[PDB]
């Protein structure tokens, strides 16, 4: 009963916001990541890294503000405030992109803290740690997209910038340059996200429409007691219903709920893997058999060839402005263009 145990006592007291040992890591880093994003989106430009306005102060709205990535010339610099690029000058730090690494790195350590908090609270309360386990999917996505991806590329510049429209731009980049929609790891992610949304809506709806009548009122919500031992809806009627509507139905509440964990978590892990590939430009860009035929046979056309022409439009039309450091100059006569448009 020395100081360590006294501190333990205090960290683990049952207060309105539980702290724990994990709170020491989580709360500063989460606060700082959030604080950095609101600060930058309110006051800080992207003029010197991107050639873009990006704060409310400059005229931007909620959709177009962003904490933009550092300039391609920073490489993968940590861009520490006290480091050799900013040299302690907070203002220069801001203008060089310092807030992006600040947010990304504190965010990373906050996500670790949050997942540790799921472990800590679960241990204290006596539950199994499946929520912590399920949160690994958010972490894998964040690390693969925000850290691994630009680390394989030339710089943090090609990471996503923290903003609504900037992320929209990220999506469109990955189509024109990586053809990401053709990637089977992205497709499994899509199935997991949509599969989970479906499971969510269909399981809630089912429970709400196989309720036992446990009260007299038209509001069925009141007729539940959190401590009652009885299932509040009929798993048997739910199973009959779905067996006869769809052919198959769940029969095991435990598998059902484990399936709901499994599907979106697996989907997100799969897409993270694809993004690791894209860090290396290891794309699912082409089908070789299609290009061989198409090159030899000018009447062969698929939706696959049509989308690559779209991709080529995106690259030539967006690259000068989106990659200013490359000083691309494309004269009018070189831009790919269909007829009239």
């Amino acid at each position: 009963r020395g100081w360590f145990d006294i501190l333990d006592d205090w960290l683990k007291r049952d207060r309105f916001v539980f702290v724990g040992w994990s709170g020491i890591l989580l709360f500063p880093c989460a606060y700082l990541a959030l604080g950095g994003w609101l600060t930058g989106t309110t006051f800080v430009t992207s003029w010197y890294t991107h050639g873009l306005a990006s704060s409310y102060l400059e005229g931007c709205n909620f959709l177009t503000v962003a904490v933009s990535t550092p300039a391609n010339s920073m490489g993968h610099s940590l861009l520490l405030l006290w480091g050799p690029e900013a040299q302690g000058d907070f203002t220069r730090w801001c203008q060089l992109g310092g807030l992006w690494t600040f947010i990304a790195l504190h965010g990373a350590f906050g996500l670790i803290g949050f997942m540790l908090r799921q472990f800590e609270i679960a241990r204290l309360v006596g539950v199994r740690p499946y929520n912590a386990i399920a949160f690994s999917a958010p972490i894998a996505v964040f690390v693969s997209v925000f850290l691994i991806y630009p680390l394989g590329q030339s710089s943090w510049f090609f990471a996503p910038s923290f903003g609504v429209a900037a992320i929209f731009r990220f999506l469109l980049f990955f189509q024109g340059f990586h053809n990401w929609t053709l990637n089977p790891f992205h497709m499994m992610g899509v199935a997991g996200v949509l599969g989970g949304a479906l499971l969510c809506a269909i399981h809630g709806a089912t429970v709400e429409n196989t309720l036992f009548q446990d009260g007299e009122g038209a509001s069925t919500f009141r007729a539940f007691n959190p401590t009652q031992a009885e299932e509040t809806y009929s798993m048997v009627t739910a199973n009959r219903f779905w067996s006869q509507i769809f052919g198959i139905a769940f029969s095991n509440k435990r598998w059902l709920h484990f399936f709901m964990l499994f599907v979106p978590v697996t989907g997100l892990w799969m897409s993270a893997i694809g993004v690791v590939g894209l860090a290396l430009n290891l794309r699912s860009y082409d089908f070789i058999s299609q290009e061989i035929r198409a090159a030899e046979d000018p009447e062969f056309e698929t939706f696959y060839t049509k989308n690559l022409l779209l991709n080529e439009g995106i690259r030539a039309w967006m690259a000068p402005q989106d990659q200013p450091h490359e000083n691309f100059v494309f004269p009018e006569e070189v831009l790919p263009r269909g007829n009239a448009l």
Binding site: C60, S161, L172, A197, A201, G204, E231, R254, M260
Partner: protein, 334 residues
């Protein structure tokens, strides 16, 4: 013992392995017709002149497509919104060239799926259930109406409806973004929130319940066998689940009422998808996403680009390239 009454009793029988019902009387044929035509077209249909410019697009496996690139191609721009059943063609050869199968499939499928939703009401009534599962399914169904029927109505042609193919789906998405800037449309944003959140809440609920299963099994057997079909006792401890999650955030951010929680699980993705279906359906009438192109300028009047302007550059490259031989005039007004 009356012949019509026996048929009626078999139609609505709760003892059939799959429920038929009156909605199913329409659903079974129309879904079979759509499914059979789709399977045959995806394998063996010849190329379809989707954009009416005598530039036929190959969609089927036998004409050099794989699973990812194959599609049943939308019907020709030359047809517009005209009805093109088989019997309106001089020959099946003609019907195939112009994209007839796409029309057959989407109209049978939309009917059969609409009857699918009714069948969900219907069996709920015969089993003594509450009625609103079909309301949840109306979110996906409205979404299929949007891309297969409503968007083609507003643009004037089934040739701009979504292809029945994987890469064709992507083509549709890209061209939609160039013509409508859907990413900047708040109803698509709500749909992303319905779909991301639904996946999130799926995972949350599945992990919280799984976290609080009551010990019923040994280490050497699946915990699933701790639940027996039709047992009356709940299989998990929601108060333990509430005590964990409430401490993870704070107490009043966690449900302790199962009925509210599952209603929320139902409501959130259903409503976000309603909006995203409404998004497609209103961009069918060209009320497009937010346009901040050149919204920021400096004291001289120089444009100061924002990320919206960068988006626009991408959108331009999709616009100038799509359907590259189909435009003769400068504006792509539909």
């Amino acid at each position: 013992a009356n012949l019509w009454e026996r048929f009626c009793n078999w139609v609505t029988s709760t003892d059939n392995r799959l429920y038929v019902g009156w909605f199913g009387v329409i659903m079974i044929p129309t879904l079979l017709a759509a499914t059979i035509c789709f399977v045959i077209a995806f394998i063996a249909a010849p190329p379809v002149d989707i954009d009416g410019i005598r530039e036929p697009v190959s969609g089927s496996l036998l004409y050099g497509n794989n699973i990812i690139t194959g599609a049943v191609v939308p019907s020709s721009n030359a047809i517009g919104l005209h009805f093109y059943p088989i019997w309106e063609a001089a020959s099946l050869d003609e019907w195939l060239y112009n994209g007839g199968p796409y029309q057959l499939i989407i109209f049978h499928f939309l009917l059969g799926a609409s009857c699918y939703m009714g069948r969900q009401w219907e069996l709920s009534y015969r089993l003594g259930m509450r009625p609103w599962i079909c309301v949840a399914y109306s979110a996906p169904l409205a979404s299929a109406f949007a891309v297969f029927l409503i968007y083609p109505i507003g643009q004037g042609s089934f040739s701009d409806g979504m292809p029945l193919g994987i890469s064709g789906t992507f083509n549709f998405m890209i061209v939609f973004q160039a013509e409508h800037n859907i990413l900047m449309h708040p109803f698509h944003q709500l749909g992303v929130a319905g779909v991301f959140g639904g996946a999130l809440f799926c995972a949350m609920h599945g992990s919280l319940v799984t976290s609080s299963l009551i010990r019923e099994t040994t280490e050497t057997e699946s915990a699933n066998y701790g639940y027996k079909f039709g047992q009356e006792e709940e299989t998990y401890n929601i108060v333990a689940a509430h005590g964990y999650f409430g401490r993870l955030i704070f107490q009043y951010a966690s449900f302790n009422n199962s009925r509210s929680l599952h209603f929320f699980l139902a409501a959130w993705p259903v409503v976000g998808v309603w909006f995203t279906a409404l998004g497609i359906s209103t961009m069918a009438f060209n009320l497009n996403g937010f346009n901040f192109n050149h919204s920021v300028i400096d004291a001289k009047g120089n444009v100061i680009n924002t990320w919206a302007d960068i988006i626009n550059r991408a959108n331009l490259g999709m616009e100038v390239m799509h359907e590259r031989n189909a435009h003769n005039f400068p504006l792509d007004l539909a």
